[PDB]
Design a protein around this nucleic acid. Sequence first.
RNA 1: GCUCAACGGAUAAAAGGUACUCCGGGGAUAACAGGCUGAUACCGCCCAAGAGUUCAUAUCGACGGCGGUGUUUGGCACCUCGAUGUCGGCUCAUCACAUCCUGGGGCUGAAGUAGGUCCCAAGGGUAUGGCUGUUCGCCAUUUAAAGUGGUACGCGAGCUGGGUUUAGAACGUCGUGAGACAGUUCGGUCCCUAUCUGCCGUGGGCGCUGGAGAACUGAGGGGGGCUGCUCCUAGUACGAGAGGACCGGAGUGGACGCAUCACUGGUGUUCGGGUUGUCAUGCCAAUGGCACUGCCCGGUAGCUAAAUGCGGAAGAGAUAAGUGCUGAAAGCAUCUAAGCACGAAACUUGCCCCGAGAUGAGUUCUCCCUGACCCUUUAAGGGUCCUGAAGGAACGUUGAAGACGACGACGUUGAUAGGCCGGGUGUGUAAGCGCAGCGAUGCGUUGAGCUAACCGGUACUAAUGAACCGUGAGGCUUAACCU
RNA 2: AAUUCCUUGUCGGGUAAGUUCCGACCUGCACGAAUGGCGUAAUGAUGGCCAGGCUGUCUCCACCCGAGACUCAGUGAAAU
RNA 3: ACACAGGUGGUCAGGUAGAGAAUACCAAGGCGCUUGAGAGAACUCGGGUGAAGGAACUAGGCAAAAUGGUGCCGUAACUUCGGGAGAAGGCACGCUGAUAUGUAGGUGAGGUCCCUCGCGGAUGGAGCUGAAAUCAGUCGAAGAUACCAGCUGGCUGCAACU
RNA 4: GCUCGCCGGAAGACCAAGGGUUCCUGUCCAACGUUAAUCGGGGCAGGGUGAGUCGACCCCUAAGGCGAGGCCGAAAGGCG
RNA 5: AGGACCGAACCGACUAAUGUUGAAAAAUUAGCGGAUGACUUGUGGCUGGGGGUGAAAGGCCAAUCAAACCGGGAGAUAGCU
Lengths: 54, 119, 123
Amino acid sequence: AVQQNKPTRSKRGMRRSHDALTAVTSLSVDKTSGEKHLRHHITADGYYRGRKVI
Amino acid sequence: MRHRKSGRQLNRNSSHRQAMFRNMAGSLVRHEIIKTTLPKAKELRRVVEPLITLAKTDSVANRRLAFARTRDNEIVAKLFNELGPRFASRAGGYTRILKCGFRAGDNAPMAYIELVDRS
Amino acid sequence: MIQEQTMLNVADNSGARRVMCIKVLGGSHRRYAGVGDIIKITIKEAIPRGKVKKGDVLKAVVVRTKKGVRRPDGSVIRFDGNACVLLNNNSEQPIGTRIFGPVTRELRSEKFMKIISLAPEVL
RNA sequence: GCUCAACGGAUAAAAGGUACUCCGGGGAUAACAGGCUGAUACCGCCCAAGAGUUCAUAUCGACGGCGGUGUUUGGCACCUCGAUGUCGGCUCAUCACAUCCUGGGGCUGAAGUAGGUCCCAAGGGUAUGGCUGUUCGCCAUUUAAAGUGGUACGCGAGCUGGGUUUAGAACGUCGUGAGACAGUUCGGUCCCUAUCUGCCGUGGGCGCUGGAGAACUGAGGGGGGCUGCUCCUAGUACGAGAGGACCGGAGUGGACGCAUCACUGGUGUUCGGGUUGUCAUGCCAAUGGCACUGCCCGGUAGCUAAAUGCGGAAGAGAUAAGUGCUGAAAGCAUCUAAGCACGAAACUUGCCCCGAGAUGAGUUCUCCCUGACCCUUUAAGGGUCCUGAAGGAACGUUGAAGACGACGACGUUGAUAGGCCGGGUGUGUAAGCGCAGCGAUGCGUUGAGCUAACCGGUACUAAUGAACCGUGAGGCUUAACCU
RNA sequence: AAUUCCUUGUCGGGUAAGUUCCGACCUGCACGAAUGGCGUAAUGAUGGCCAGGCUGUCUCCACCCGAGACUCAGUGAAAU
RNA sequence: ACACAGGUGGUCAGGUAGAGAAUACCAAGGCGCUUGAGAGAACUCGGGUGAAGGAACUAGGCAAAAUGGUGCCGUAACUUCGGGAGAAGGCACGCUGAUAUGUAGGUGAGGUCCCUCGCGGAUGGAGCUGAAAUCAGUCGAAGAUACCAGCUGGCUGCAACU
RNA sequence: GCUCGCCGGAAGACCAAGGGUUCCUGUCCAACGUUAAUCGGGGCAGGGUGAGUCGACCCCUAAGGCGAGGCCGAAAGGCG
RNA sequence: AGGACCGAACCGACUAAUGUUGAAAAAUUAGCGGAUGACUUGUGGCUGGGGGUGAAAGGCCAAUCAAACCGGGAGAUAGCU
Ligand SMILES: [Mg+2]
Ligand SMILES: [Mg+2]
Ligand SMILES: [Mg+2]
Ligand SMILES: [Mg+2]
Ligand SMILES: [Mg+2]
Ligand SMILES: [Mg+2]
Ligand SMILES: [Mg+2]
Ligand SMILES: [Mg+2]
Ligand SMILES: [Mg+2]
Ligand SMILES: [Mg+2]
Ligand SMILES: [Mg+2]
Ligand SMILES: [Mg+2]
Ligand SMILES: [Mg+2]
Ligand SMILES: [Mg+2]
Ligand SMILES: [Mg+2]
Ligand SMILES: [Mg+2]
Ligand SMILES: [Mg+2]
Ligand SMILES: [Mg+2]
Ligand SMILES: [Mg+2]
Ligand SMILES: [Mg+2]
Ligand SMILES: [Mg+2]
Ligand SMILES: [Mg+2]
Ligand SMILES: [Mg+2]
Ligand SMILES: [Mg+2]
Ligand SMILES: [Mg+2]
Ligand SMILES: [Mg+2]
Ligand SMILES: [Mg+2]
Ligand SMILES: [Mg+2]
Ligand SMILES: [Mg+2]
Ligand SMILES: [Mg+2]
Ligand SMILES: [Mg+2]
Ligand SMILES: [Mg+2]
Ligand SMILES: [Mg+2]
Ligand SMILES: [Mg+2]
Ligand SMILES: [Mg+2]
Ligand SMILES: [Mg+2]
Ligand SMILES: [Mg+2]
Ligand SMILES: [Mg+2]
Ligand SMILES: [Mg+2]
Ligand SMILES: [Mg+2]
Ligand SMILES: [Mg+2]
Ligand SMILES: [Mg+2]
Ligand SMILES: [Mg+2]
Ligand SMILES: [Mg+2]
Ligand SMILES: [Mg+2]
Ligand SMILES: [Mg+2]
Ligand SMILES: [Mg+2]
Ligand SMILES: [Mg+2]
Ligand SMILES: [Mg+2]
Ligand SMILES: [Mg+2]
Ligand SMILES: [Mg+2]
Ligand SMILES: [Mg+2]
Ligand SMILES: [Mg+2]
Ligand SMILES: [Mg+2]
Ligand SMILES: [Mg+2]
Ligand SMILES: [Mg+2]
Ligand SMILES: [Mg+2]
Ligand SMILES: [Mg+2]
Ligand SMILES: [Mg+2]
Ligand SMILES: [Mg+2]
Ligand SMILES: [Mg+2]
Ligand SMILES: [Mg+2]
Ligand SMILES: [Mg+2]
Ligand SMILES: [Mg+2]
Ligand SMILES: [Mg+2]
Ligand SMILES: [Mg+2]
Ligand SMILES: [Mg+2]
Ligand SMILES: [Mg+2]
Ligand SMILES: [Mg+2]
Ligand SMILES: [Mg+2]
Ligand SMILES: [Mg+2]
Ligand SMILES: [Mg+2]
Ligand SMILES: [Mg+2]
Ligand SMILES: [Mg+2]
Ligand SMILES: [Mg+2]
Ligand SMILES: [Mg+2]
Ligand SMILES: [Mg+2]
Ligand SMILES: [Mg+2]
Ligand SMILES: [Mg+2]
Ligand SMILES: [Mg+2]
Ligand SMILES: [Mg+2]
Ligand SMILES: [Mg+2]
Ligand SMILES: [Mg+2]
Ligand SMILES: [Mg+2]
Ligand SMILES: [Mg+2]
Ligand SMILES: [Mg+2]
Ligand SMILES: [Mg+2]
Ligand SMILES: [Mg+2]
Ligand SMILES: [Mg+2]
Ligand SMILES: [Mg+2]
Ligand SMILES: [Mg+2]
Ligand SMILES: [Mg+2]
Ligand SMILES: [Mg+2]
Ligand SMILES: [Mg+2]
Ligand SMILES: [Mg+2]
Ligand SMILES: [Mg+2]
Ligand SMILES: [Mg+2]
Ligand SMILES: [Mg+2]
Ligand SMILES: [Mg+2]
Ligand SMILES: [Mg+2]
Ligand SMILES: [Mg+2]
Ligand SMILES: [Mg+2]
Ligand SMILES: [Mg+2]
Ligand SMILES: [Mg+2]
Ligand SMILES: [Mg+2]
Ligand SMILES: [Mg+2]
Ligand SMILES: [Mg+2]
Ligand SMILES: [Mg+2]
Ligand SMILES: [Mg+2]
Ligand SMILES: [Mg+2]
């Protein structure tokens, strides 16, 4: 469990290649208050598909 | 391996996984909607709703059985006076989960669990 | 299901009442013997005087296992003591002449037609 | 005058121990393993006195001769001292063939049975214990067999530390002693997350030159091959008797593997009950908490093996040793030179598995796009607009799929999970009431009550209208039918 | 024998089998009388051996509940 | 050297069991130990259970399992007379009722007598507390039920022992 | 605030040791805190330690230190 | 009566598993021994590097021992890397 050389930035990036975080693909919109909340999630207001919960 | 099993361990032991769900089921029937995380509220489902399906059919012995389930003199009287007859027609499903994003200090994916009746 | 170092009761009249298996016979790396097998036993505790003394080495046959025998229909037959019947190294047929206890039906064959006449209950 | 004799002569003068040790160095120089000869070791050959009733050759071989293998004991001191952990066990192997078993053939001083001995054959298989620290060894007992070797006398960044090995102690023996002694008992810290090569698994991007949904052909690869015994033929042949088969058939078991859980069981801190000790729910009853589920008894589905189903094949081809057929060289004998036939677990197949990243990138039936343009990149080129379909990704419900990915089912047209009614299954007459009694307690309603995953059911809850990505006839050359 | 090399000396119990153990022989390589001989009730976190009880030590490992190891969020080392 | 599973002398001592400052649950009182939320793999640490056999494991019963308290009967060779000895092995134990509507025992108030006198000395028995045993009767698979709580025996080597 | 848990011969209530504002009251989150952080034992500022009887000095000593003169050492000094 | 027995405080540290850039540069959890005596412990004072102390292992004497720690000769000397 001890290395014998110092590897390079090339190998460091070649490992770091697969760190590809993607963002949210698209958001989704209400039908009585109209904001861009997450898909299958409540709004910050408290709306979900028409209802105003609290 | 876990094949065909049930239940959820939830990173607590089993003197904990009944003593927590006592307090959670002692708060949900009290306030009819609370804010708690998603695996703790997808499986609080079948801990609170058979407690209401039992309370649908009033007796004397069920006032000891749900007293064993809850150990709260307030909640047994409210569960058998108000929340009994108000759902006396459905075939179950007295709950509803609504996802409310995430949480501040730990990125805990929360949820809103509720009864169907607030209006 | 008799392996090595199994301490058996002796079913018959031939003086021994506590034996100890040392081998199972009939195939390499063998582990288990039920009814119908020929294990090899020493003799650990005889009576005051009998046909065989202490320290003899002679073959036997397991006749009553606590693991039980398994019929065609799936039904099991279990006992309450691991016990065997003594034998003879040059004749493969016993030394004593009276067999106590019951023995099982799945032992009868013309190698062993002599322990099915004396036994009071062919189970 | 100086046996300075260690004789170019250090002083007029000098012995040991360190396993309590420390330092500078040293692979110049030892042990461990390599590398180099190959003297000893082992195994094949050559002459053939004799032994074997006759007879060197069935089996042995004197006095001598020549090599092979690198395998023991050794020789040299090269790599290695600013360190490569050493014997034996445990766990995993792989190759070698001088082959232990099993397969096929010739010889015999081979009647049969069982053997002797070389020749071909390495696919597969190869004992559990007693004893010492032990490989071995001896002994007890099986089996078809308990092979021989290299791999740092395989394997301590995988594991015991008993052996030899540090510090303590003692006995024998040696020295006056300090302490030593392949002599001995007794107790004696074994460190490390994997960067890279390697290996078993699971995956994203791109290419496969229009793009997507699937099913496949298979050049190569990889696991697999074992064997006992009883019964028929047949107590036949052979044999004086005693004994006792070839060659083919029928059954049942062990070791090793593949699955699955219906039967027999194992677990079942999520399902019933009994029970102690203590504190609380105001209290009596009734339930819950804590002391390893407090101690137990039972136990559903799943996971599992000791539980029960299947496998090892049969066949085809050319083959190794050997027996042949025809037949010259050499008019005759000759398996060989021409040719023709047989031949075994080794070989290729046959059984099965992942298998087009086979770049030699495939085969294959399907479904979708048939719009306008201007700019210099003059055409395989850059951009503005209606176009954004096939289909996949993402999100939610999740699973006999699972580390995370990935694979699979469902997405209001729908049972994908959680719920709920009726059932099943497990525990074993719940609480409450009335009777009996001094009371523990029984009896009735009562096989009642509770019920985890389990088989068939119900839209009450959760799975959102969309949005996001993928485009508009496919490049060039050469050949062939056709308008 | 804690001292014995030839050695697993020699015999008998113990075991199916016993290079260790207990009992005798003496050919003691090289015990031996206050660097002590032999013996002995009790005692020892002492050396060596057998027996009953007990069981995953093991033939043969299967399941279960918990703290880690795998995923996501914040802080974020070390040998080389 | 860390807001360290380390160490440091004295004082106080509640309940229900209990021989007791052991142990199990508690009140007075204090804390949830300064990272979390998930999925339910190999493997490892700490643990509970196990069919048939029961030391075949190994250097070795290492580890693990088991025994385990009070009362009574009983107890070997050997010996320095003490020991060995808790040798070994066994038997009863929960609650209820009676003997006794709470006994044997402990404590002790009134009532009365003299009085060398005061914080009296005796007769006296109210009331409180309360063992231990015997006999009937009853529930479970199991009555020291949980926690604590010795494995036993047989020959030797060394050293008297603490 | 109220459900649950853990110690209860301690992890409850105090002092002699030793540290030296860590104590209370406002205010701040940059470093400190193994995370977040409005909270703090952290940064700043302000308050807080009242004795005839309780602890130190104080009268007297134990081990032992110093020790006028005194004895003995080269000086240092060593005892007493 | 005990240099007595079983056993908590207290003192010690026999075996095994954890862990050996760990919570600790020697501990933790389940077991262990002594536990009115040759014991254990808070305070103070005494001894000193060829010397102190030792129920004796070359042990221990400020995480250092077959001759401690600090300053000086000293930039000790080195045929050796
Ligand atoms: Mg290097
Ligand atoms: Mg399921
Ligand atoms: Mg000279
Ligand atoms: Mg000279
Ligand atoms: Mg000279
Ligand atoms: Mg001279
Ligand atoms: Mg020594
Ligand atoms: Mg020494
Ligand atoms: Mg050195
Ligand atoms: Mg060098
Ligand atoms: Mg060299
Ligand atoms: Mg050598
Ligand atoms: Mg060498
Ligand atoms: Mg060599
Ligand atoms: Mg050669
Ligand atoms: Mg040859
Ligand atoms: Mg001849
Ligand atoms: Mg020959
Ligand atoms: Mg080398
Ligand atoms: Mg090096
Ligand atoms: Mg070396
Ligand atoms: Mg050959
Ligand atoms: Mg032959
Ligand atoms: Mg092969
Ligand atoms: Mg082979
Ligand atoms: Mg083949
Ligand atoms: Mg063995
Ligand atoms: Mg032995
Ligand atoms: Mg052997
Ligand atoms: Mg070798
Ligand atoms: Mg070799
Ligand atoms: Mg070898
Ligand atoms: Mg080796
Ligand atoms: Mg290695
Ligand atoms: Mg090894
Ligand atoms: Mg050793
Ligand atoms: Mg890595
Ligand atoms: Mg890797
Ligand atoms: Mg892929
Ligand atoms: Mg092949
Ligand atoms: Mg099953
Ligand atoms: Mg089933
Ligand atoms: Mg169970
Ligand atoms: Mg209770
Ligand atoms: Mg009660
Ligand atoms: Mg509690
Ligand atoms: Mg608990
Ligand atoms: Mg069962
Ligand atoms: Mg089952
Ligand atoms: Mg052919
Ligand atoms: Mg011819
Ligand atoms: Mg011919
Ligand atoms: Mg075959
Ligand atoms: Mg074949
Ligand atoms: Mg449906
Ligand atoms: Mg449903
Ligand atoms: Mg139902
Ligand atoms: Mg039932
Ligand atoms: Mg009940
Ligand atoms: Mg009832
Ligand atoms: Mg009835
Ligand atoms: Mg029932
Ligand atoms: Mg269903
Ligand atoms: Mg001896
Ligand atoms: Mg000697
Ligand atoms: Mg010897
Ligand atoms: Mg002997
Ligand atoms: Mg002797
Ligand atoms: Mg002597
Ligand atoms: Mg003398
Ligand atoms: Mg002692
Ligand atoms: Mg033995
Ligand atoms: Mg932890
Ligand atoms: Mg981690
Ligand atoms: Mg992270
Ligand atoms: Mg802290
Ligand atoms: Mg913490
Ligand atoms: Mg966590
Ligand atoms: Mg797990
Ligand atoms: Mg257990
Ligand atoms: Mg078992
Ligand atoms: Mg059981
Ligand atoms: Mg053994
Ligand atoms: Mg033990
Ligand atoms: Mg135990
Ligand atoms: Mg002693
Ligand atoms: Mg508690
Ligand atoms: Mg206590
Ligand atoms: Mg401060
Ligand atoms: Mg402040
Ligand atoms: Mg901070
Ligand atoms: Mg902050
Ligand atoms: Mg403060
Ligand atoms: Mg502050
Ligand atoms: Mg005043
Ligand atoms: Mg005073
Ligand atoms: Mg004085
Ligand atoms: Mg003085
Ligand atoms: Mg003076
Ligand atoms: Mg000590
Ligand atoms: Mg020690
Ligand atoms: Mg301890
Ligand atoms: Mg004691
Ligand atoms: Mg004592
Ligand atoms: Mg000195
Ligand atoms: Mg020191
Ligand atoms: Mg010196
Ligand atoms: Mg000088
Ligand atoms: Mg210098
Ligand atoms: Mg110099």
